Design a protein around this nucleic acid. Structure first.
Ligand SMILES: *O[C@H]1[C@@H](O)[C@H](n2cnc3c(N)ncnc32)O[C@@H]1COP(=O)(O)OP(=O)(O)OP(=O)(O)OC[C@H]1O[C@@H](n2c[n+](C)c3c(=O)[nH]c(N)nc32)[C@H](O)[C@@H]1O
Ligand SMILES: [Mg+2]
Lengths: 732, 737, 95
RNA sequence: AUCUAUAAUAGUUUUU
RNA sequence: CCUCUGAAUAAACUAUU
RNA sequence: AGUAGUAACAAGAG
C-alpha cells in the first residue's frame, strides 16, 4: 500500500489543511555568489517592457533615459509600461470624488508631520548605501559621514535638527561645483575631490544585491538599497501615502495581523450584503506581473501633483522631489563575476566596473548577451534605469493607485449593470464582481483588465483565478467563509532565539502562548511544544538537569550547585533546575514563577547587582539596587542576562579604526548622561553643542544647590572656576 | 564636582574636544547609534555556533578581580583577551554558574516592589478558581482588548507626562498637568515615592509598567478585561471553554459593564417568550458574571440602565428611571418617545443612520460639576437651563444637550476628517462620535447653532456662542441660572410594579420602563458571563446563537424530522428557536413566519419533494405567530452586530451555506455539522419550497418566452407555466398550483 | 543691506546668539534681515538689563558675589525650560 | 463608549 | 614558519520590553 | 571527487 499524503485532501478541504502544503521544516534557499547577473537581467527586462518609449539624454548626468509615458496602447497581453497620464489623473479625480476631502486632510496631516519630523528619523533602518564609500554602511554611520562631509563643505542647515533642513542641505549640495571627502587605505587619511557630475551620479545611485532565504521561489532575484540623499523625500512621500491609505476601506495597508483580518472580513461581508439577491457574484484571486518594473516614477509625480493641489508651494516641492530623484536613478551592478582556469587551476575576481570595456570571450552565451544589451546604459560604474520602481519602495502609493482602479468599479462610473470592488495591498488584490449573468461577469472582468492596462497595471493571467464568492486568497491569508489558521507559517519562530538564557526562555514560552491564542495550537500540542523547547534549550545552553550524567564542560559546576542547594524547584533551568511550566502559567516569567522556592543565598547570588555579567551605573558610585543592563523579552535581569561577543572581521580591514571612534563617542555620551539624567529615558532635542549645554546645566545646578543650601560656597566657587576654564578651553 | 572635572579632562584632549564642540544635542542621538556594524543576520545559528566556543560571553574587567581564573578542577572560567571595539574581556558560562553558587549574597527584598506587576500576575493565578470544562461550538471574534490595564482615567501621553513629572521634575519641558486626574495621580505617586532610593530610570520603567495602558487586536471569546486576557490561552479554545475566575480584586466599572450587557441580552431574549416575566426571572437566576451570581450584583450594584432596572423590578427591588449619556445622568420626568432609524447626511459629506426618538419629553441632567433641565421634541431642543460651576462646566453641559437634541444644525456642524467606522471597519455609535468630535472644539457648533434675544426673566444670565455672559441675546433656547440643583432627589429609588410583559409602572400607575426602551446594541462583556441551562448559548451573541440553533436542529434531526412530518404545531413552539426569533426584525417576524409555514404546507401536499436543507434553513423562521399575506420573499434578514444579513431561500448564502461534496453545513464560517442522507429525499430536481404558491419544475425553458421578476408573478393563473428569474442569476421554469 | 549693518554694529557674541536662535526654527538670517536685527536688539537689551548687578550676602542688589538676574534668552528652548523648571522647583514661583 | 504614543530587538508577508 | 578572521536589503505588521 | 545550481565552496588575508 503506497502512502500518498496528498490523498488526505479527498476528505479534508484544502484550506482546512493548508498548513500541510508549506514545507517550512527544511532550510530555505540561499544565493551563493554574485548578484550582477540578476541586476543586469532586471535592468534589461525593465527597459524591454518600455522599449517603444522615447529615448533622451539627461543633460545633468548624461545617462540615456527611456520614457514610456503616453506611449502606444498595447495590442496584446504582454506586460507593458505605457501608462496614460490622463487616465491616471482621471482615476485620482474620481477617487477624490468618491471620498470628498481625503486629499485635503491627508495633506494637512502630512504638513504637520513634515514640519515636526526630526533628522534622527533617518537613523532608523539596517543598512544604507553610503555615497562617500561606494558600499553599504549602518544607517547611523552613513548619516554621520554625510553630515560630516556636508559640514566640511559648508552645508550646516542640518544643525537645526529638522529633517527638512537636511533636505535643504541635500538640494544645496546638488549645486556645489565640487565636493571633498576623505578616504582610508593601508589607516591613513587622503582627500578626494568629486566634480559636479560625479557627485550627482553618486547621489542618485541605489545599491543592488541578491536576496537570501526566501520561501516558495525556485530562482533568485535582486533587491535594492537606497542612498542617503533620497531617504528623507521617500519618507515624506510615504507618510502622505499612509495618511491617504488610512482613509480607504479597500486598502490592505498599513494594517496587519488580527486587525487586518477583521478589516478584510468586514469589507468582504459588506460587499456581500450590498450585492443584490438576484445577481451573480464572483471573486478573483489575482496577482500583478512585474508590478514594480512597470510602475513609472513620472506617474507617481503626476499623482502627487494632483493630490497636493491648493497647497503651499514648499509642501508641493518637498513632496515632488522624490519622484524627480527616482526617475533619474542609477543602479549599481554588484560585486562582478569570478573566472576560473582549469588547466592552471586558479580563480580570480572581475569587478563590475570593468564590464564596460571587458572582452566578451570569458563569458558564456547568456552573460555575454546581458552585457551586450546593457552596455549602452553603463555610466561611471552604474547602469541608467529611468523606468520602474526598483524593489519594495512606494508600496503605499502603489496601494493608492490600485485602490483608485478598484474605486472605478462603482455603478456611477461603469454606467452598466455590472460593477466591482475588492481589496488591494501594494500589488496583490482580490476582486469581487457582481453582474446579472455570466456575460456581465465576463464584461466586468474585461473592463477591469483593460482599465488596469491603461494605468500600466498588468494582471497575471497564469497566477490569477476566479470562482464564486465565498473563498479566496489574499496576501497569503486563505479565506474559506472566514480566514483559516495556518500554523506552518509561524513554525520557524519556534526554537531558541539566541539572545541569552533568560530572553530565550521568555521568547519560547511566549511564542507557545501566542500561537495557542492565534494559530489554533491545541493544549496537548502546546505541552509537547513546551517539552521540545525545553529540550532544545538545555542542549543549546549546556544546562541539563543537575541530577543527570550528561558530559559537558558546564556539568561540573551545575552538579556542585545542585548538590549544595536545598530547594531544587527554585533553581532555574539555566542552573540545572526542573521545568515548572504548564498551560496555566505560560504568561509568567520564570524567575517570578519560582521566586517563592529559591534559597536565600542562591536568590541573592542570582539577583546581585554587582555581577560583572551586567554593566553598572555610576550615580553616586554604583546603583546597587537591581541588576540593570534594551530589555526585550527579559522582564527581570539576572546573571543569565549576559551579552555574547561581537564579530571581529573589521579588525582585518582599513575601517578598524572606526571602532576607536565609536568607543570614543560612547565615552562622550556617557558624560552627557551625568548632566541630563533623562537623556537615556527620552531622546534630548537641542541645537547647542554638547559642551555648551553641559556647562550651562552645571552652572544652573550649582546656583540652585547653593541657593537651596545643598552645597557650600567653596564648592560653588570651584564649580564656577572650572566652568570658566572649560570656556577658555572651548576657544583653544 | 566629578562631572565637571571629567568634562574638563575630556575637553583637554583633542579628539574628545572636537566631538563635544562640533556635535549638537540633536546629533548626539545619531552618534549614539554610531557603530562599525552589528554583522548578525541569523541570531539562532550564531548562538549555536558560539556556544561551542571556549569563551563566548563578555564581562567587565572587574570579573578578573572577583572570580578565580580556574575552578576546583582547573577548568578556565575567563581569559584576558578583550572584546573588539570595547575593553570588556571574554568569559565562559562556567563563570556564570560559578557565581550563582559561590558569589557574594545580597538582599533582594525590594525586587517584588520593582516588578510588582509580574508578582501580581502570580498572585492572581495562585488564588484563582477553576470550574468545569465545557465542549461547545466556540465563535471567537476579533476585537480590541487591553493587555496592560494601566490606570483607569489616563492615556499614553498623560501617563508619560506624569512619569516625567514624578521622576524628572526639571526635564518636563513646557508641559503643565492640567487634568484633575493627572494632578491627583502625580500627587499620590509623589507621596508614595517620597524618599525613594531606587534609580530614577528604573522608577520610570516601573511607573510605565503600572500606569501606561496597552491595547491590541485579538480573537477573543468571553471577557475582554485585562485579567481575563492574560489567561486567554487557558480559558478559551477552538472547541472547549474552561471556567476560571481570577483570584484578585475585580473593578466595579467592569462589573457594571458586564451587568448591563447581561441584562440587555436577557431582556431581549425574554421579550420573544410567551411568558416574558418568568423567563426573565429564571434567566437572571441562572446567570453568573465573573463567578458571582447575578442576583447578588443586582442587589448590591447601583447601576442606572433600562435593562438593569427591568431586572431589578422583576426581582422586586427599587429602581431609578435614569440612564447615562455623555457623562450626565438623564431622568425623564415627563413625555414619551418611540425609536426610529433615520438616515442623515453629515456636515462633512457622510451618510449615516441615527436612532431618533420622537415625541415631546422633559429631562433633568445631573453631572459631577454641572446640572441642567432640558425640554425637547423630535429633533428639536425646546429649551435648556444650565447651572454649572464655571464656564467650562456650562460649556460641556451645553454641548451634551445640543448633541442629545439630535438637531440638524448639530449634524451639519460636523467638520474635518471625522469617521464613523473603526480602524477595522466596525461600526461606531454615531452619538458617541459626535460627542467626542464636539468636545474637542465646538466653535463651529456654537456659531451655527443660532442666537435669539432673551426676555431677562428672574435674573438668569445669558450665554453667547463665544461663551460669555450676555444679557440681551443668547444661544437659541439656552439659559444660565444659579439656583437649579435638585440633585438629592436624583438618588431616590422608587417602588415600582412590573407587568407580565415587562412593563414597569409607578405606584400611581404610570409606565416608566418597557422592553422597547432597551438599547438594541449588541456589545461584549468585560467579565466572563456564565449561563447554566440546557442551552448554554441562550444569551450569547448573534453568531453563536445562529450556529448553535442550526447545530441543534442538525443534531436532533431524527425526532425533529418526525415531528415536522407529523405534528408541526408543537415543533414551531420549541424553546430553542426563541433566541433565533430574537434576531429576526420584529416588524418582519410574523410575515416571515407566515411565508415559511405556507412553504412547509406545500412541501407536505406535493410528494417526492423533500429537501432536508430547505427545511433546516427555514425552520427557525416559523417560530413566530404567523401573519397571512401574499408577499414573495427571496431572502430573510437577521440582525447581526447591527447589520442586516440575508439568508437566501434558494441556494447558498453568506450566512447559511451547504456543501454537497462534503455534505456539510457552514453558518457564518462555522461548521454546524454534516447532514445525514435520507432515502425519502427527492432526487428529481424538483423544488416545492421556494415560492409561496408556485412549484419549480426545471431549468430554463425558452418555450414560454423571456423570464420575469419574482414580484411580477401575481398575474399568472392556475396551471400556467412560466420562466422566472428566481435565484442568483438563474432562470427556471415553474408552474402555479 | 540690513544684515551688513547688523553684523558690523553688534558684538560678535550677540550676533552668534541671534543667528543660532534663527537657525533653531529654520529661519535664514540672509533672507530675513529685519528679524535678524530685531533679535539682536532684543538680546542686547536683555544683556544690558541683566549685566552689572549683584546680590550681597544680606540680600540687597548692588553694582560693581552672585548675579541678580538669570538670563533665559539666548538659549535653545530645552535649556531655557530646564532653567525655568529648576527655578520654579527651588522657589515655588508660578510656572 | 473610544483607542495608530514613542525607541530597541527578533519573526512573518510582499516570482518574467 | 608565524599573526589575525569566520560576515548587518526596503515597507508594513506581529511579540516583548 | 563532493556539496551545490544560473554561482559559488572545495580556506582568505597580512
Ligand atoms: O459600554 C456601553 C454601555 O454599557 C455603557 N453604559 C451604559 N450605561 C452605563 C452606566 N449607567 N454606567 C456605566 N456605563 C454605562 O456605555 C456604553 C453605551 O454603549 P451603547 O450601547 O453603544 O450606547 P446606547 O446604545 O446605550 O446609546 P447611547 O447613545 O449611549 O444612549 C444612552 C441612553 O440615552 C438614550 N437616549 C438617547 N437619546 C437621544 C434619547 C432621546 O432622545 N430620548 C430618550 N428617551 N432617550 C434617549 C439612549 O437610547 C439610551 O437610552
Ligand atoms: Mg495575490
Amino acid at each position: 500500500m503506497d502512502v500518498n499524503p496528498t490523498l488526505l485532501f479527498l476528505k479534508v478541504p484544502v484550506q482546512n489543511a493548508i498548513s500541510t502544503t508549506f514545507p517550512y521544516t527544511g532550510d530555505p534557499p540561499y544565493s551563493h555568489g554574485t548578484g550582477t547577473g540578476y541586476t543586469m537581467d532586471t535592468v534589461n527586462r525593465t527597459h524591454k517592457y518600455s522599449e517603444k518609449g522615447k529615448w533622451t539624454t539627461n543633460t545633468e548626468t548624461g545617462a540615456p533615459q527611456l520614457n514610456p509615458i503616453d506611449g502606444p496602447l498595447p495590442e496584446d497581453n504582454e506586460p507593458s509600461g505605457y501608462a496614460q497620464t490622463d487616465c491616471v489623473l482621471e482615476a485620482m479625480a474620481f477617487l477624490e470624488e468618491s471620498h470628498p476631502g481625503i486629499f485635503e486632510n491627508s495633506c494637512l496631516e502630512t504638513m504637520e508631520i513634515v514640519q515636526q519630523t526630526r533628522v534622527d528619523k533617518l537613523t532608523q533602518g539596517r543598512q544604507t548605501y553610503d555615497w562617500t564609500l561606494n558600499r553599504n554602511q549602518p544607517a547611523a554611520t552613513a548619516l554621520a559621514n554625510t553630515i560630516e562631509v556636508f559640514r566640511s563643505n559648508g552645508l550646516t542647515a542640518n544643525e537645526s535638527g529638522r529633517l527638512i533642513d537636511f533636505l535643504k542641505d541635500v538640494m544645496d549640495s546638488m549645486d556645489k561645483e565640487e565636493m571633498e571627502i576623505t578616504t582610508h587605505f593601508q589607516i591613513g587619511k587622503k582627500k578626494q575631490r568629486l566634480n559636479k557630475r560625479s557627485y550627482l551620479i553618486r547621489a542618485l545611485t541605489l545599491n543592488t544585491m541578491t536576496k537570501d532565504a526566501e520561501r516558495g521561489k525556485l530562482k533568485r532575484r535582486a533587491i535594492a538599497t537606497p542612498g542617503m540623499q533620497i531617504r528623507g523625500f521617500v519618507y515624506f512621500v510615504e507618510a502622505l501615502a499612509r495618511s491617504i491609505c488610512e482613509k480607504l476601506e479597500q486598502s490592505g495597508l498599513p494594517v496587519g495581523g488580527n486587525e487586518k483580518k477583521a478589516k478584510l472580513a468586514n469589507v468582504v461581508r459588506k460587499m456581500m450584503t450590498n450585492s443584490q439577491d438576484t445577481e451573480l457574484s464572483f471573486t478573483i484571486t489575482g496577482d500583478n506581473t512585474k508590478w514594480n518594473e512597470n510602475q513609472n516614477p513620472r506617474m507617481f509625480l503626476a499623482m502627487i501633483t494632483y493630490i497636493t493641489r491648493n497647497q503651499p508651494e514648499w509642501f508641493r516641492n518637498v513632496l515632488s522631489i522624490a519622484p524627480i530623484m527616482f526617475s533619474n536613478k542609477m543602479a549599481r551592478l554588484g560585486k562582478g563575476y569570478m573566472f576560473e582556469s582549469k588547466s592552471m587551476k586558479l580563480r580570480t575576481q572581475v569587478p563590475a566596473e570593468m564590464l564596460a570595456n571587458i572582452d566578451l570571450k570569458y563569458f558564456n552565451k547568456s552573460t555575454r548577451e546581458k552585457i551586450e544589451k546593457i552596455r549602452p546604459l553603463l555610466i561611471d560604474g552604474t547602469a541608467s534605469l529611468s523606468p520602474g520602481m526598483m524593489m519594495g519602495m512606494f508600496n503605499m502609493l502603489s496601494t493608492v493607485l490600485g485602490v483608485s482602479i478598484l474605486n472605478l468599479g462603482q455603478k456611477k462610473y461603469t454606467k452598466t449593470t455590472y460593477w466591482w470592488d475588492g481589496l488591494q495591498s501594494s500589488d496583490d488584490f482580490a476582486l469581487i464582481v457582481n453582474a446579472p449573468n455570466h456575460e456581465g461577469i465576463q464584461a466586468g472582468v474585461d473592463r477591469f483588465y483593460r482599465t488596469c492596462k491603461l494605468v500600466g497595471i498588468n494582471m497575471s493571467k497564469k497566477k490569477s483565478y476566479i470562482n464564486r464568492t465565498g473563498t479566496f486568497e489574499f496576501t497569503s491569508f486563505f479565506y474559506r467563509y472566514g480566514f483559516v489558521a495556518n500554523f506552518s507559517m509561524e513554525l520557524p519562530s519556534f526554537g531558541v532565539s539566541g539572545i541569552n538564557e533568560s530572553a530565550d526562555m521568555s521568547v519560547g514560552v511566549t511564542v507557545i502562548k501566542n500561537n495557542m491564542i492565534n494559530n489554533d495550537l491545541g493544549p496537548a500540542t502546546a505541552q509537547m511544544a513546551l517539552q521540545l523547547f525545553i529540550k532544545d534549550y538545555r542542549y543549546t545552553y549546556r544546562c541539563h538537569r543537575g541530577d543527570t550524567q550528561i558530559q559537558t564542560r558546564r556539568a561540573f559546576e551545575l552538579k556542585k550547585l545542585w548538590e549544595q542547594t536545598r530547594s531544587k524547584a527554585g533553581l532555574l533551568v539555566s542552573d540545572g533546575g526542573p521545568n515548572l511550566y504548564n498551560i496555566r502559567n505560560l504568561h509568567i516569567p520564570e524567575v517570578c514563577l519560582k521566586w517563592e522556592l529559591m534559597d536565600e543565598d542562591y536568590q541573592g547570588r542570582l539577583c546581585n547587582p554587582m555581577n560583572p555579567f551586567v554593566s553598572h551605573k555610576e550615580i553616586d558610585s554604583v546603583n546597587n539596587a537591581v541588576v540593570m543592563p534594551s530589555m526585550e523579552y527579559d522582564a527581570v535581569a539576572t546573571t543569565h542576562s549576559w551579552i555574547p561577543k561581537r564579530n571581529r572581521s573589521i579588525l582585518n580591514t582599513s575601517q578598524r579604526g572606526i571602532l576607536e571612534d565609536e568607543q570614543m563617542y560612547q565615552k562622550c555620551c556617557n558624560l552627557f548622561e551625568k548632566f541630563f539624567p533623562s537623556s537615556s529615558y527620552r531622546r534630548p532635542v537641542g541645537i547647542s553643542s554638547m559642551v555648551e549645554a553641559m556647562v550651562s546645566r552645571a552652572r544652573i545646578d550649582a546656583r540652585i544647590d547653593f541657593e537651596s543650601g545643598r552645597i557650600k560656597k567653596e564648592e560653588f566657587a570651584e564649580i564656577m572656576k572650572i566652568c570658566s576654564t572649560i570656556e577658555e578651553l572651548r576657544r583653544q | 564636582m566629578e562631572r565637571i572635572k571629567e568634562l574638563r579632562d575630556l575637553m583637554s584632549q583633542s579628539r574628545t574636544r572636537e566631538i563635544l564642540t562640533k556635535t549638537t544635542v540633536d546629533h548626539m542621538a545619531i552618534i549614539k547609534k554610531y557603530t562599525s556594524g552589528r554583522q548578525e543576520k541569523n541570531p539562532a545559528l550564531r548562538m549555536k555556533w558560539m556556544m561551542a566556543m571556549k569563551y563566548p560571553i563578555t564581562a567587565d574587567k572587574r570579573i578578573m578581580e572577583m572570580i578565580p581564573e580556574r575552578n576546583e578542577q582547573g577548568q578556565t572560567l575567563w581569559s584576558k583577551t578583550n572584546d573588539a571595539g570595547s575593553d570588556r574581556v571574554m568569559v565562559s558560562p562556567l563563570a556564570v554558574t560559578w557565581w550563582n553558587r559561590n558569589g557574594p549574597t545580597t538582599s533582594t527584598v525590594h525586587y517584588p516592589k520593582v516588578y510588582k506587576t509580574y508578582f501580581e500576575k502570580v498572585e492572581r493565578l495562585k488564588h484563582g478558581t477553576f470550574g468545569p470544562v465545557h465542549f461547545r461550538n466556540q465563535v471567537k471574534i476579533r476585537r480590541r482588548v487591553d493587555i496592560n490595564p494601566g490606570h483607569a482615567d489616563l492615556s499614553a501621553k498623560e501617563a508619560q507626562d506624569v512619569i516625567m513629572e514624578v521622576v524628572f521634575p526639571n526635564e518636563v519641558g513646557a508641559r503643565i498637568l492640567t487634568s484633575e486626574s493627572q494632578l491627583t495621580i502625580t500627587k499620590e505617586k509623589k507621596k508614595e515615592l517620597q524618599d525613594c532610593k531606587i534609580a530614577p530610570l528604573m522608577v520610570a520603567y516601573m511607573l510605565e509598567r503600572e500606569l501606561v495602558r496597552k491595547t491590541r487586536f485579538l480573537p477573543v471569546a468571553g471577557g475582554t478585561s485585562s485579567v481575563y486576557i492574560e489567561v486567554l490561552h487557558l480559558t478559551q479554545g477552538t472547541c472547549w471553554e474552561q471556567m476560571y475566575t481570577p483570584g484578585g480584586e475585580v473593578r466595579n466599572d467592569d462589573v457594571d459593564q458586564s451587568l448591563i450587557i447581561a441584562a440587555r441580552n436577557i431582556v431581549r431574549r425574554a421579550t420573544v417568550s410567551a411568558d416574558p416575566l418568568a423567563s426573565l426571572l429564571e434567566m437572571c437566576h441562572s446567570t453568573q458574571i465573573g463567578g458571582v451570581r447575578m442576583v447578588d450584583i443586582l442587589r448590591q450594584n447601583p447601576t442606572e440602565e433600562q435593562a438593569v432596572d427591568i431586572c431589578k423590578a422583576a426581582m422586586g427591588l427599587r429602581i431609578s428611571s435614569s440612564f447615562s449619556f455623555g457623562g450626565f445622568t438623564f431622568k425623564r420626568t415627563s413625555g414619551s418617545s418611540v425609536k426610529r432609524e433615520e438616515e442623515v447626511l453629515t456636515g462633512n459629506l457622510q451618510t449615516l443612520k441615527i436612532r431618533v426618538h420622537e415625541g415631546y419629553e422633559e429631562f433633568t441632567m445631573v453631572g459631577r460639576r454641572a446640572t441642567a433641565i432640558l425640554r425637547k421634541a423630535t429633533r428639536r431642543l425646546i429649551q435648556l437651563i444650565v447651572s454649572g460651576k464655571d464656564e467650562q462646566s456650562i460649556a460641556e453641559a451645553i454641548i451634551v444637550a445640543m448633541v442629545f437634541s439630535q438637531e440638524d444644525c448639530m449634524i451639519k456642524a460636523v467638520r474635518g476628517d471625522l469617521n464613523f467606522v473603526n480602524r477595522a471597519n466596525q461600526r461606531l455609535n454615531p452619538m458617541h462620535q459626535l460627542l467626542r468630535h464636539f468636545q474637542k472644539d465646538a466653535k463651529v457648533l456654537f456659531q451655527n447653532w443660532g442666537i435669539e434675544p432673551i426676555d431677562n426673566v428672574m435674573g438668569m444670565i445669558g450665554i453667547l456662542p463665544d461663551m460669555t455672559p450676555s444679557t440681551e441675546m443668547s444661544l437659541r433656547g439656552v439659559r444660565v441660572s444659579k439656583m437649579g440643583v435638585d440633585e438629592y432627589s436624583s438618588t431616590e429609588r422608587v417602588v415600582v410594579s412590573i407587568d407580565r410583559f415587562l412593563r414597569v409602572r409607578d405606584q400611581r400607575g404610570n409606565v416608566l420602563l418597557s422592553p422597547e426602551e432597551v438599547s438594541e446594541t449588541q456589545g461584549t462583556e468585560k467579565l466572563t458571563i456564565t449561563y447554566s441551562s440546557s442551552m448554554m448559548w441562550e444569551i450569547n451573541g448573534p453568531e453563536s446563537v445562529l450556529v448553535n440553533t442550526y447545530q441543534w436542529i442538525i443534531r436532533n434531526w431524527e425526532n425533529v424530522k418526525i415531528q415536522w412530518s407529523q405534528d408541526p404545531t408543537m415543533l414551531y413552539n420549541k424553546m430553542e428557536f426563541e433566541p433565533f426569533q430574537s434576531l429576526v426584525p420584529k416588524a418582519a417576524r410574523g410575515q416571515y413566519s407566515g411565508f415559511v409555514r405556507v412553504l412547509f404546507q406545500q412541501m407536505r401536499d406535493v410528494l417526492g419533494t423533500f429537501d432536508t436543507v430547505q427545511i433546516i434553513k427555514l425552520l427557525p423562521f416559523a417560530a413566530a405567530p404567523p401573519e397571512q399575506s401574499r408577499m414573495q420573499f427571496s431572502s430573510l434578514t437577521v440582525n447581526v452586530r447591527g447589520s442586516g444579513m440575508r439568508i437566501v431561500v434558494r441556494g447558498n448564502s453568506p450566512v447559511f451555506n451547504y456543501n454537497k461534496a462534503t455534505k456539510r453545513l457552514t453558518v457564518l464560517g462555522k461548521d454546524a455539522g454534516a447532514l445525514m442522507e435520507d432515502p425519502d429525499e427527492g432526487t428529481a430536481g424538483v423544488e416545492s419550497a421556494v415560492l409561496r404558491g408556485f412549484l419549480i419544475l426545471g431549468k430554463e425553458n425558452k418555450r414560454y418566452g423571456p423570464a420575469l421578476s419574482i414580484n411580477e408573478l401575481s398575474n399568472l393563473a392556475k396551471g400556467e407555466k412560466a420562466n422566472v428569474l428566481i435565484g442568483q442569476g438563474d432562470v427556471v421554469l415553474v408552474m402555479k398550483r | 543691506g540690513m544684515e551688513d549693518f547688523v553684523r558690523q554694529c553688534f558684538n560678535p557674541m550677540i550676533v552668534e546668539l541671534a543667528e543660532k536662535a534663527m537657525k533653531e526654527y529654520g529661519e535664514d538670517p540672509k533672507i530675513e534681515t529685519n528679524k535678524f536685527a530685531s533679535i539682536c536688539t532684543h538680546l542686547e537689551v536683555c544683556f544690558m538689563y541683566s549685566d552689572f548687578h549683584f546680590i550681597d550676602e544680606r540680600g540687597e542688589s548692588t553694582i560693581i558675589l552672585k548675579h541678580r538676574f538669570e538670563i533665559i534668552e539666548g538659549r535653545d528652548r530645552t535649556m531655557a525650560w530646564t532653567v525655568v523648571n529648576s527655578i520654579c522647583n527651588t522657589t515655588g514661583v508660578e510656572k
